[PDB]
Amino acid sequence: TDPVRMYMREMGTVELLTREGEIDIAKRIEDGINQVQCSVAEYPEAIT
Amino acid sequence: GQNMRVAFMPWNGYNFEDSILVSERVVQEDRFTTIHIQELACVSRDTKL
Amino acid sequence: HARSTGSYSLVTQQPLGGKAQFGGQRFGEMEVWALEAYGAAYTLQEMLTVKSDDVNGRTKMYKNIVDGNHQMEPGMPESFNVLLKEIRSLGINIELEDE
Amino acid sequence: ARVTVQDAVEKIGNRFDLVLVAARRARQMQVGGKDPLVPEENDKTTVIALREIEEGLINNQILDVRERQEQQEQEAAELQAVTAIAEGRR
Amino acid sequence: AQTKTEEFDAIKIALASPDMIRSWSFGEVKKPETINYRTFKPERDGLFCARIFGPVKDYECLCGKYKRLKHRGVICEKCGVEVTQTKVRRERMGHIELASPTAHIWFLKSLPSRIGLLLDMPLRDIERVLYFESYVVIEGGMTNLERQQILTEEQYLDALEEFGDEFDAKMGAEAIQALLKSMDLEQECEQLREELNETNSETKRKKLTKRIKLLEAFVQSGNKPEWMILTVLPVLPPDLRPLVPLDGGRFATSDLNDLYRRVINRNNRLKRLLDLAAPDIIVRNEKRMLQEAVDALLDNGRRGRAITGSNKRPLKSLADMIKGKQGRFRQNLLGKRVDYSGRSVITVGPYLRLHQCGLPKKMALELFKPFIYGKLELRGLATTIKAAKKMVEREEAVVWDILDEVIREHPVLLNRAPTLHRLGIQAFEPVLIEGKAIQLHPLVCAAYNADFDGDQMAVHVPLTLEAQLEARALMMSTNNILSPANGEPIIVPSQDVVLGLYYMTRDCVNAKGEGMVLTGPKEAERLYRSGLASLHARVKVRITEYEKDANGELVAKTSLKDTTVGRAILWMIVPKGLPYSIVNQALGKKAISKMLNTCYRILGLKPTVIFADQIMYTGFAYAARSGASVGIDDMVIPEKKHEIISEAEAEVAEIQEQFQSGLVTAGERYNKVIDIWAAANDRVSKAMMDNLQTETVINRDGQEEKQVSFNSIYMMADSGARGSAAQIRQLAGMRGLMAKPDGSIIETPITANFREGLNVLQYFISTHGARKGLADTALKTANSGYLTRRLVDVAQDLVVTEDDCGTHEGIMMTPVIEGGDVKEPLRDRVLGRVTAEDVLKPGTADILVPRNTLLHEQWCDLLEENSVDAVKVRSVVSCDTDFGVCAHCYGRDLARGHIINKGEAIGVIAAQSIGEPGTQLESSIQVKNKGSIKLSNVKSVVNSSGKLVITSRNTELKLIDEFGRTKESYKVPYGAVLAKGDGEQVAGGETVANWDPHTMPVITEVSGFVRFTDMIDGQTITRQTDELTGLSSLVVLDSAERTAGGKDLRPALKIVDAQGNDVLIPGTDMPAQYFLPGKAIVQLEDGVQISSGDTLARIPQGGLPRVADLFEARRPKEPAILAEISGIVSFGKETKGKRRLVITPVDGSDPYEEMIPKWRQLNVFEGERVERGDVISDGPEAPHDILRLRGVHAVTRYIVNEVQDVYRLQGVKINDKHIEVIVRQMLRKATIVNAGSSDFLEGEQVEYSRVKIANRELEANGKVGATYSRDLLGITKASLATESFISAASFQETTRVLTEAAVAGKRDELRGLKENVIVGRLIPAGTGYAYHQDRMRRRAAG
Ligand SMILES: Nc1nc2c(ncn2[C@@H]2O[C@H](COP(=O)(O)OP(=O)(O)O)[C@@H](OP(=O)(O)OP(=O)(O)O)[C@H]2O)c(=O)[nH]1
Ligand SMILES: [Sr+2]
């Protein structure tokens, strides 16, 4: 089968990040959502 | 399957190609009467109706 | 074995045997050559439509026998009607064009 | 003709055209009345139609001439109705 | 104009548009749902639906609120279901909206790729983009990448940073759709035609022409390359892929339903993933399987192989429904179930007539079931249909009376499996007989391959008046007394009938009652049945015979004839319009068959049918009166059987002494010992025909012994009723020789006959041939059945179009003579054929024989007295008749007594006439007439032995008679011995020239000793056995099987004198060294002295497969070399043992050269004037080479003669007209030389170019005369080139044809016979031919 082989080869290039490497990405997620939440708070219609 | 009287002679087209004649005595005397037992099944089934 | 009319199969609307009456005799392509070699045209027409797959053909022709008409009045056989939908489902346009 | 049809084939020509000519005559005797030209000594409609070809009483030419007459006889005996209809349409 | 009329004439196939798919659809399938587990009903918007496809019940809604047939076409507001019949679920379709564009498998994987050829890109480059591995460039400008460039992710990243914006490149199937979007079809065709001007090429030109042929066909139809990638996917109706509850309770679903679910599932997931965060890795992988999901749905057997959810089987895809030996396209012909049909075991019917059959009572009541109900309510016996049903089931006495009335005058067809020819289905008028078995007429049983031992026949009943008439006028046995294969009658008495007439006509020495005068043939019956005279003995009888008058009929000649009592009674059976001389002789199968053949043309069709039955009735009666019985005493053994055997038994032991001594070698013993037993087997067989043939001896009148034996076995053999002379050999005389598993014949044959007890070893020996011969018979029907299938598919679409074709051109017909014996005379060959040119032969005074007329059986008799030779008659090959045969310029119908009427399919009869009897599948010139041998171009040289061997390439033989004229013409090849030289008188029956038929000898010029220079044993030459001279001889091997040690060695014989020096060849001072080619066999040894004329070395050159090989036009292993251009031709240069032929005429240009293999022996030496089509290498000729040079006439007669030679040896009679029909189907499709309208190569029909050339040279604005060369295509090479996609996909590969028809946009107008069988329309042949002409004429006007 073809579709089974190359899928394992696409994610094979991407290496696993562990421990404190996961937190580095996780910190950008929560700071990314908070920046959006700051933009909604600044908008006057959102309060209305 | 029993044995009968056999005569190798042409007839009036009743033994054209491999065809074999029989006497009424073959039918009268049970010499080629075969018994056949047959099975017939009736199944009562449960349906959605 | 002998059959005039009876039950028909689901996927293809051609004769099928099971109960009461026996199954019909298959008219193969070797038998088709014979009628093609002969001047026969209406007999093969019967073998393909009213005796086989044609749904509207068989019942309408059967009533003509009882009435004393002996007329075919053939149409589209179910052997080709299924074939048309199978090509359309592939993604290839197939249509019937008039005169 | 029950056994051989050769006597009827010679009258028209083609064996296939013989079928279509006799089929028109058979269907006329089957549904639309039509009295047999050749004395009906039992037999079915398929053979009686071939009996008329052998004597030379029915043909593709003869069937067309008689169909022209029957169409015009049903036209003249119904002209009274057609003329009335056409007046209301205009 | 009509809009709602469904009467179609043509069907077209093209690519479907995404908007066009929505037109077929009635709703969108968004859910993979089928049926609820609680209530068995369709669900919301799944595969099975009532809102989209239709209601499950007849005229009802899902809930059950809307009931009765009252509501019609009402759209529900509660459910959304249209109140209609459930047959709507069989016609209505759905659609699935794809989130991502997925490619079609039929246009991608199917070779040589429809998407690939259109974009000029290999499949490896397309798949890597589609599969998501690399990017592809669509738009180009100043980005250095131009077009169709494959780029990796790392290459694409750097390329965008340098340029970007204006640069456009996408990834996946979206890129391919965009690539087909941007391409301009109008400008691509202009660029390709410009480049094909200076650089043309030859082999690489084919792929450039392939692109143009694909592009030009794409624009003219208007398919648009954008629809190649699927965006909207159509769905099948639920009825075709059903979920039905079975008898048990477990459901049964189609494999299509399982495939459709695994398409929607990932389609719904992709719609989710595109809005719920889209990482490329997962999104590309979901698009990867979605493309595979459609691929598995359409054609599963291409990319991977899908497995069913519960079963371990490949699922039936959409492509697998059409093809797969048994599908939907192929079941239209073969797998067709038929109503009004019966089947029973066959039985004899001697009391029945030729037009009568013995159909069973209970079968006929079941078959004519609706016919009974029709003529029961009409009579006033039954009230209604249901009351008539009860009368039939109860088997009432009155029903049997009505049943006989309906059956009378109603024909019934009888079919037997298998049908090889058309006579397998014949109509008969049934006679009601009680029993479960069907009775068949003994005479028509010869037409079928039937034997009353356990055979079954299909019983078909026609329904309509048209069907009833074409059964009586065409398919009736009385109308079909002759065979369609040959002019000889097929309905011929056999077995019992032949034996009855044989005993009746044969005479004895002195039987009861002899020397009486007898008043009429009536008194002959008065004596026999009473008991006063026997059937035999020569008794004078008064007879009144009626001969045919010139006008007919008044001739009544009465004379006293010297016949027997039995011959006089049979005259009463013989009709009036037939001579008495035909019944005067002792009648056998050969003689009785001549009676019906003569009775047909002299009287007619009706008189011979009544006579045919009258022979049968009388045949059985007198066969019963005779009382022939096969006894053990009738199996007479020759007087001195073991006496002959003993003379040959120890004669083998005599050569066994030579086996050990060395007089006769071990290899020469086997073929010499076997000749003794072969001569002994014939000696016993000839001695057997003395104690069985004429063994009577005891004669009461006189003292004589000469009489035909009254033995029961000989009576069956001499008459030809049952059992030939070969069968009698094994039973009474000797069985003969048997074969080994290898193929060789066993040393000692079986001496014991079937009269005595065979040995245990002898019986085990005889079993090999029994289990090998019948094993060949088991696959004989399969091989010949495929041969019948092969010949049909190429010639089926051929019918008679015109009554006469305006060409006075045909084929030269000469009686076939092999060496010095006539196989078939002119009468049998030119019978039926219509002449093209008048008879101009002088012999008897007359005013010309008219042309363009049918040659009657009596008209051919006139040509016999005049002795006519070489008559050019109008044939099937030479026809310029649009699309078909031209009736008059063809010949007679063999089944009928006149010309074949227009409309009848010739090609179907022609294929069946050869496929049916296919189941049964010179060296020295001798002169009889006195004269004198005169020789020209003689180069003969006398050798040491005393053989006049000629040293010339071309030699002809001529005879000079008493007056001084040439009598016979014969050709003499190289390496032949002549008996007499120039001007020598010959006697009646003497051989003048002799040579070995299967060899090519090499003759030396100089005399002396033989040297073996460069002839090292083992390295170049090997030792085996020559099978012609023979003994142990050296074999020269070609440059392929030689060892690595001796690479550069030339095999040649050097001629030296007594001293050791070379004897020079007269002419050049070069040493004598004859270079020997490969395969050649050397007979001479080292040191042996030879004279001028001695041979140095000799160079060596089935049944049903042979017939199949000739019809397929396959070239032999060793093709014959022929000269191509006429003129002064000379050889050029040399290599080792080969010559390069340079052919140059006298006129302008003419640049031509040839290359010839080394082992070939030529028929020209140096500086020879050779013509077009001359033999250079002797042996088999290539079918393509004859058409290339000799023309389109010598090749056509080559196919006829070579095929007939196979059937003549087996004993089969097939006319030459049937073969030439298939030949015309081989010659079709021709290559164009001159520029006309489209390309140079291509593929256009001969008549298609003939319509073109007739239109271009006069009008149509072209003025160019397109020159064409005829091409030969052997059946399968011609059957692929049909101008119909419906006809092609029937026997050819389905997926290739349907894709080719879609891209080109082909239209099938339904003209072929096979085309109309599939669609369910009338055949453009026979009865439907007159119907078809009514619609074809109204296409131009309207
Ligand atoms: N035994 C026998 N009889 C033959 C044969 N050929 C013809 N007949 C008989 O001749 C009768 C008429 O046959 P046709 O073929 O119509 O002859 P026709 O045209 O000259 O009248 C039929 O009688 P019918 O069926 O009673 O028809 P009808 O007389 O009621 O019309 C048929 O039985 C034959 O080969 N053998
Ligand atoms: Sr009447």
Ligand SMILES: [Sr+2]
């Ligand atoms: Sr047989």
Ligand SMILES: [Sr+2]
């Ligand atoms: Sr058999």
Ligand SMILES: [Zn+2]
């Ligand atoms: Zn409802």
Ligand SMILES: [Zn+2]
């Ligand atoms: Zn012609």
